[PDB]
Design an enzyme around this catalytic site. Structure first.
Site, PDB file in Angstrom:
ATOM      1  N   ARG C  62       0.841  -1.188   0.000  1.00 55.57           N
ATOM      2  CA  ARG C  62       0.000   0.000   0.000  1.00 55.57           C
ATOM      3  C   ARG C  62       0.880   1.244   0.000  1.00 55.57           C
ATOM      4  O   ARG C  62       1.792   1.367   0.827  1.00 55.57           O
ATOM      5  CB  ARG C  62      -0.926  -0.002   1.217  1.00 55.57           C
ATOM      6  CG  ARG C  62      -1.710   1.293   1.486  1.00 55.57           C
ATOM      7  CD  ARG C  62      -2.541   1.136   2.785  1.00 55.57           C
ATOM      8  NE  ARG C  62      -3.302   2.327   3.152  1.00 55.57           N
ATOM      9  CZ  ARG C  62      -2.938   3.204   4.083  1.00 55.57           C
ATOM     10  NH1 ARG C  62      -1.819   3.064   4.775  1.00 55.57           N
ATOM     11  NH2 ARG C  62      -3.717   4.253   4.324  1.00 55.57           N
ATOM     12  N   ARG C 109      -9.791  21.832   6.671  1.00 56.74           N
ATOM     13  CA  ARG C 109      -8.666  22.278   7.479  1.00 56.74           C
ATOM     14  C   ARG C 109      -8.871  23.710   7.955  1.00 56.74           C
ATOM     15  O   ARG C 109      -9.506  24.526   7.280  1.00 56.74           O
ATOM     16  CB  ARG C 109      -7.349  22.170   6.707  1.00 56.74           C
ATOM     17  CG  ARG C 109      -6.962  20.736   6.392  1.00 56.74           C
ATOM     18  CD  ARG C 109      -5.462  20.532   6.468  1.00 56.74           C
ATOM     19  NE  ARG C 109      -5.117  19.116   6.431  1.00 56.74           N
ATOM     20  CZ  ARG C 109      -4.900  18.362   7.501  1.00 56.74           C
ATOM     21  NH1 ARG C 109      -4.951  18.865   8.727  1.00 56.74           N
ATOM     22  NH2 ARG C 109      -4.621  17.070   7.338  1.00 56.74           N
ATOM     23  N   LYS C 255     -13.448   3.212   1.193  1.00 54.06           N
ATOM     24  CA  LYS C 255     -13.127   3.342   2.607  1.00 54.06           C
ATOM     25  C   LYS C 255     -14.327   3.934   3.341  1.00 54.06           C
ATOM     26  O   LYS C 255     -14.778   5.042   3.018  1.00 54.06           O
ATOM     27  CB  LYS C 255     -11.880   4.202   2.788  1.00 54.06           C
ATOM     28  CG  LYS C 255     -10.631   3.535   2.238  1.00 54.06           C
ATOM     29  CD  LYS C 255      -9.476   4.512   2.149  1.00 54.06           C
ATOM     30  CE  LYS C 255      -9.102   5.067   3.514  1.00 54.06           C
ATOM     31  NZ  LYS C 255      -8.005   6.081   3.390  1.00 54.06           N
ATOM     32  N   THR C 313      -6.133  -0.347  10.416  1.00 47.91           N
ATOM     33  CA  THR C 313      -5.706   0.732  11.307  1.00 47.91           C
ATOM     34  C   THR C 313      -5.558   0.343  12.775  1.00 47.91           C
ATOM     35  O   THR C 313      -6.529  -0.035  13.439  1.00 47.91           O
ATOM     36  CB  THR C 313      -6.644   1.935  11.188  1.00 47.91           C
ATOM     37  OG1 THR C 313      -6.705   2.331   9.813  1.00 47.91           O
ATOM     38  CG2 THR C 313      -6.091   3.115  12.020  1.00 47.91           C
TER      39      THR C 313
HETATM   40  K     K Z   1      -4.810   8.009   2.750  1.00 46.73           K
END
Ligand code: K
Ligand code: K
Ligand code: K
Ligand code: K
Ligand code: K
Ligand code: K
Ligand code: MG
Ligand code: MG
Ligand code: MG
Lengths: 519, 519, 516
Positions: C62, C109, C255, C313
């Site tokens: 990845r 952000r 995802k 994760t």
């Molecule tokens: K990413």
């Protein structure tokens, strides 16, 4: 409305499956449960046997409790004549098996005094002497009754019950002594000549295979019968005796052991191990043990036979009323249906076809009911539970069978085609109870006749010569099964079938599984 | 050898449960399945009825297809004289219920040659004319047949099939007329007087509740009958019509809808919702639909009734051969056992007790088979699936019933004792199918008689006055059940029972459950 | 004698009984069915370390495009392929290694204060979109760059700042500002990430940067894309659009990162090639105590569909600094395999940690043990039940073959396939034995790692003129690979799935075959 009880098939629980059963869900054309018909004066002519076949008979039972060898040889000749009258059309020909049902250790009474037709009334509470003195052989009456079990006095005590004439008349032994018994009529009735006698709870010491049985069994080998229904099997050793008499020349005849007494039920496991199959012989069984318990023995035996993959036959009085009437009672239709749901490989008719007024109608009624009940089985659960019971075995053919039945469920295959010469591969497919018919193609005629003992196996005799190459010989037999399925309406072009073959001539079982469209 | 098929009970799968059924495993004394007997000339005397009760009769059915009010009134009087002859010993006294079976929309032929007993022979292929002309209602012969369905010409077409005398004879219409039908005999036979006619697949427009039915229903109210079996119920509005005639005076009489034609099966869900219970009326059913399909509707109806907790009766030809013989066929034994295994709350006898030569023997046989089959149920799976099917409901009494049944399984309780005046709390326990008997103590005599409709409820009538302290009134009634249970041999001192009671007088259901040792 | 492979537990009647029978002394088999996805970064990107990664079990490399230039990632991929092909000398031992691109994805952000300011619980804080303050953020005013924020948040909504450290509650809504009461205080830096729990964010499926990075992945011939922050099917469609014709065979793994993605999961799954449970971002968006619910729900429904699902994760997070994982991390890997994940993933553990090979090796060991401890008979029954609406012919072959494999304890299932579809359908029904998928399509082989239990074998031999010879040649290649890797030995039994003819279209022929 889904056909074939397929809505019910999708249920999560047995109760929900039951609640989904639908009288307007049509069954399929193929009938998986085999139909065995006892041939007799009502059905032994060639003309009637042909109709018997067209109505759905798969196996002709010859009952050697009565009849000379000449009589049975003629009956067998007529069955074969009727069966081969259909070999004109190879695709539509149906093989028909021949079964010999032994007399075994029967006890009977003598002749009523007078002229042949006479009957005497045994009144309740009256007394009756049982004698062994051959002087009374042919002058039985309501005061003295002769029977042919010379040792009866050794195996009954005071208090013992004697049942006479299919259990309709019951006597209690009041006094003994050798050479005679004094009894009291408990349940009366009219008594005729040469009626059957049962001694429940007694330890009858007649031989499992008698001199007469040996002659009948040898006669069966000479007549090339397919199977023997062995009466009053009480222990594995009884089965071994029958197999010894059939000897080397009869080693391929299947032995079906009839369970019809208490010891037979008690020693069932060892009798099944030794047998090729089992008949629940409910007639005698319901006299030997309390009638209210027969359903317990029937369901236990059918289950254990299903567990082992050995054929089991449910027999006797299934459509009794149709001996005199053209439609059965509601209990009789329910009885046939529940034997199929129980898992019986075959169902049987005795007097209904041997002597009744409506033998054809009885055959046709079993065909109709069997098909309805076959769709009403809860296949998914049955398969899971059968797989569970056999999970100790890792046998490769079983693996092929389970994978094929599982595949047939998944894509709702119209049939499973199995190429087999011994029949073994197809027997293992049947044991896992697919919904769809199993078309077994074989060049072995005896294998085809004996295949009717297995639920769902529709045998097809291949008569073509062996082809030069294996691929072509396999393809030839597969397409024969395609043409048979089409002609009988089991499936049409574009349906899907499961096909089980051997990869090479030397594969010892069908190790190749294909999913194939019907051409 | 564990009793009560408890070894089979511990099985993981249905197949394993089957394989463990054991004819040497003794059932318990109590029989949970109610027995409904049709009363008639063979069973009508007080002395015979006393033996009927001792043999196990729980409900007396009066069949209003025949007989005058005066005749049935005397039958009901005898049933009550017989029943009360045992009130001298209150601990052994058994309530007997009285049921009224309506004629309903029946079709009947006239008299053969003016005679009730004459017969003619209808030969296959012959012509036969059906007239409505009342001039011929007592002049039927092999050429001309009268029947009483005035509108029959409206609802049948050329080609329609006509069935006569319990479907044993069949005719096919060939020409219609204003008040006649010309037909051809298809299935021949001997035709007697006043026989039933069935018109499968015909929009029969006869009222569900005729003028005669209304008279009979009001006679039932006057006679204080416990239940009505309503014939040929086709839709929920039919039940409503019956409930309307019974009125406020008859509001507590249970209506059992008889399912005996195709529409009744198709509309079953709405019929169940409107009915207090259901009868699978297999006689007419197996004429109105193909007889090989009847087992499908039987299992579907029983399952759906079990799901709803409403009583279901299996009826007709269960022991039919015993009309003439002192023991049943093997199909009849299997039929009774399978009805109990399906989940039927009650089984019924019709001709076997109304007119047969062996009414007592028939009742005793149903009793014996039921006990065997009740132990052979797969209680753990049945409970799980019943609970699954009703899990959308959070009803508090169902919670008590399921907890009490679960507790009774866990500790192998000998009985459940339920205090109830309406029967409701006991019915909710019955619905989840405990193995042990349910002793329902009530002060309402009618609640006690109607309790026979529910599997496993043994009603006991408390005749003591209400104790001023609630705790003591409860104790008095629980101790009464203890003494009755002991006297009848359901349990002994030191056995354990589940006891369901109301915490206070104003509790509307049994909100209290205890495990209690028998004193 | 103790049965290997938790076979005693396998014979249990109930889940509880299966659990009670798990046996630390019942040895697992050699083959590992769960794919291992390693993030390659500074700790792991030299050719020599990538060779050890492959030997230790890595199946998928990845590249995380949250950081690094195209030049940086191009070199990493080159190193992966250099390491992969260094084993191509021996076709019987060569392992395919796939390459995956993980997108940065759209972001929210803040502005500038490297200064820091402390927010205190109960204090007021105003969020503005006014670019005047874009570089003048302080205690009272905070700028961010998501100009539609007021369209998607309500009064009472929360706004998370800096991976969930700060939380604000919206008290007042302006047309272009929000007044919030800081709930969770802290120190607030510059250019921090913002999350909008429960919001339907209308950010684009792919950012400008993502478009450039996806085109780069097509040029780099990557096998699959991990698409960040997928919220609806239209997001997946948009990613396939950018991949275009040249990349139409690249698999799209969506995802699941926030509330909307979980709530709309069914439509995302229908449109995707596979799913990643992105637990890090997920646990920032939804309460951390609910992540296991989403994880188990997603794995279940992916299993149902037969589509690949990745658990990602923090699985072995402590191994970033320590050579051995915690007991919670061992449990987490085992339970993801038991849940049904086709692949498990490593991020910082391999991209930047001190013990990258140790982490790969631990995932390998845990997965083999957990694979044996699944309750295969129940799993199979429940997968059959969930898909029983379908009568598809290849599923029927898959189910019958898996069933045959259970009954005779086959050592492996050999599947010949060019697209992989036949092998995918076998994987979907969760055999215990490994699936050796022989293919001449090198991309099918690299992509097969997404599916539980598939060991891809690349056939480099020319097509034999006779069909029967071409099939034999490929079956024998699998026989040889299985024996060399110790999956089986002469005299074992395998299930073999082949096409009857070159045009059969799927593996319509199943055999039980002894290992020669
Ligand atoms: K990413
Ligand atoms: K015989
Ligand atoms: K064979
Ligand atoms: K009636
Ligand atoms: K109550
Ligand atoms: K393929
Ligand atoms: Mg017999
Ligand atoms: Mg009726
Ligand atoms: Mg993210």
């Amino acid at each position: 409305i889904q056909t074939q009880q397929l809505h019910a098939a999708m249920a999560d629980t047995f109760l929900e499956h039951m609640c989904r059963l639908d009288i307007d869900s049509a069954p399929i054309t193929a009938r998986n449960t085999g139909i065995i018909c006892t041939i007799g004066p009502a059905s032994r002519s060639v003309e009637t046997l042909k109709e018997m076949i067209k109505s759905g008979m798969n196996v002709a039972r010859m009952n050697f409790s009565h009849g000379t060898h000449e009589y049975h040889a003629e009956t067998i000749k007529n069955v074969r004549t009727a069966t081969e009258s259909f070999a004109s059309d190879p695709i539509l020909y149906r093989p028909v098996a021949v079964a010999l049902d032994t007399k075994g250790p029967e006890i009977r009474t003598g002749l009523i005094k007078g002229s042949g037709t006479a009957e005497v009334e045994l009144k309740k509470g009256a007394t009756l002497k049982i004698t062994l003195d051959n002087a009374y052989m042919e002058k039985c009456d309501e005061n003295i009754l002769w029977l042919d079990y010379k040792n009866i006095c050794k195996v009954v005590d005071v208090g013992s019950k004697v049942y006479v004439d299919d259990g309709l008349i019951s006597l209690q032994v009041k006094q003994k002594g050798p050479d005679f018994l004094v009894t009291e009529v408990e349940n009366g009735g009219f008594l005729g000549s040469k009626k059957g006698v049962n001694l429940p709870g007694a330890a009858v010491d007649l031989p499992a295979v008698s001199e007469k049985d040996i002659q009948d069994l040898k006669f069966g080998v000479e007549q090339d019968v397919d199977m023997v229904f062995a009466s009053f099997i009480r222990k594995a050793a009884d089965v071994h005796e029958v197999r010894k008499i059939l000897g080397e020349k009869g080693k391929n005849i299947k032995i079906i052991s009839k369970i019809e007494n208490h010891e037979g039920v008690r020693r069932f496991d060892e009798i099944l191990e030794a047998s090729d199959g089992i008949m629940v012989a409910r007639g005698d069984l319901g006299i030997e043990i309390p009638a209210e318990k027969v359903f317990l023995a029937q369901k236990m035996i059918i289950g254990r036979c299903n567990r082992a993959g050995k054929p089991v036959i449910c027999a006797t009085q299934m459509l009794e009323s149709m001996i005199k009437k053209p439609r059965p009672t509601r209990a009789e239709g329910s009885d046939v249906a529940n034997a199929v749901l129980d898992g019986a490989d075959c169902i049987m008719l005795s007097g209904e076809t041997a002597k009744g007024d409506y033998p054809l109608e009885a055959v046709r009624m079993q065909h109709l009911i069997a098909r309805e009940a076959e769709a009403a089985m809860f296949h998914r659960k049955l398969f899971e539970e059968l797989a569970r019971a056999s999970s100790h075995s890792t046998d490769l053919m079983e693996a092929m069978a389970m994978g094929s039945v599982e595949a047939s469920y998944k894509c709702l295959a119209a049939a499973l085609i199995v190429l087999t010469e011994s029949g073994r591969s197809a027997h293992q497919v049947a044991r896992y109870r697919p919904r769809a018919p199993i078309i077994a193609v074989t060049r072995n005629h005896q294998t085809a006749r004996q295949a009717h003992l297995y639920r769902g196996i529709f045998p097809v005799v291949c008569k073509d010569p062996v082809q030069e190459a294996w691929a072509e010989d396999v393809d030839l037999r597969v397409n024969l099964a395609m043409n048979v399925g089409k002609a009988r309406g089991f499936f049409k072009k574009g349906d899907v079938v499961i096909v089980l073959t051997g990869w090479r001539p030397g594969s010892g079982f069908t190790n190749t599984m294909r999913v194939v469209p019907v051409p």
